[PDB]
Design a protein around this ligand. Sequence first.
Ligand SMILES: Cc1cc2nc3c(=O)[nH]c(=O)nc-3n(C[C@H](O)[C@H](O)[C@H](O)COP(=O)(O)OP(=O)(O)OC[C@H]3O[C@@H](n4cnc5c(N)ncnc54)[C@H](O)[C@@H]3O)c2cc1C
Length: 377
Amino acid sequence: SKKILIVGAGFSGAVIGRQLAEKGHQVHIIDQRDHIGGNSYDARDSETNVMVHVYGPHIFHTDNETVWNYVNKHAEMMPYVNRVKATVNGQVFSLPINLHTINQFFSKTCSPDEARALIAEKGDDPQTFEEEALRFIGKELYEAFFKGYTIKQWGMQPSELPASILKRLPVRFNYDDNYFNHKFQGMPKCGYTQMIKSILNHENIKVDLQREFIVEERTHYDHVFYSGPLDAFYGYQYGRLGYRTLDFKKFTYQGQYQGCAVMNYCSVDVPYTRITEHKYFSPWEQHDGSVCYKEYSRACEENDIPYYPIRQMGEMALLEKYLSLAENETNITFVGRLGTYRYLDMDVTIAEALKTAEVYLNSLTENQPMPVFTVSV
Ligand SMILES: Cc1cc2nc3c(=O)[nH]c(=O)nc-3n(C[C@H](O)[C@H](O)[C@H](O)COP(=O)(O)OP(=O)(O)OC[C@H]3O[C@@H](n4cnc5c(N)ncnc54)[C@H](O)[C@@H]3O)c2cc1C
């Protein structure tokens, strides 16, 4: 029976914790926040009865059946297919770019094959160096849907990012407006917080909230699983890792503010990146009042929640410093979106957390040392 400290009550910590707890280990899970869930956390607005996704829209989607089966054990999963609109050029469009977006954009009536001909004769360019340089789609579409969105979202010009990150033509030549191509797509009936609470619901798990990790503690345990920022663990001794932060400005509207869950504003002339109307993530509930967030993207200064990691040369170079400090550590595994500096989806989080616990469990049945990283960086 091993004594485990987990730093974080998000999917990583909850899922590693419950796998271990079930093989009889004594798991202690701590979180600096006053609530479990991590960034997947949702709460019901008190004035409105609206399930608010507190750290932004969280839509569940996976091609992994084992991950799907696992979340259904812990929540009632509701069919929910996310559909995004975008406002730009004084018009409202379906996202991703599809047959309707094209026909509406160019005031046309193209069939799919006619639209393929349009996009080819609208594309521009020998050997492409920039993301700006992807005239897959041409100038009007790059500018409408891609340029101002990158500037607001990444605080960068698309001529500044590499040609990668846009591997394929970003258009779908039919009227399917599902945003996500994943096989399994749903929404927990009662939210992610109730889901993760269920996950944490084992006698071998003790949860302590409003509690920050303190390094000296590490010596009271057989192993630590750490889902906190990898640079923060080292006190940012080499400097902070590049992140974008988000500000959410909350407002309550009486009625329906926008008529969909998520509306993107592609233009630089709109300072928020998108508006989320949370009641739309629970279509099986009726709400008179509505909680909405205007979302603002910005450089992660000090005291900000890290959201989206910027991952270019400068950052990876700085990461490499922490990476070789860390690969020298003896009884710790860094896991999750922050412990590893990657953007991970919820389903990919749980996947990696089931595998992490499985690796650790194996390491005991055997002879063998538990690695500091369970996935490559
Ligand atoms: C804006 C945004 C929107 C997203 N929407 C989707 C979506 O629609 N679909 C999808 O699949 N995924 C979505 N995600 C991804 C999802 O949020 C992540 O997969 C999930 O947050 C991973 O959780 P985690 O357990 O690995 O880490 P986290 O959720 O960040 O949890 C880490 C926990 O560690 C705690 N912590 C950190 N350091 C310490 C410390 N030193 N001491 C104590 N506690 C500490 C924090 O308080 C936090 O609660 C989104 C991500 C972002 C940023």
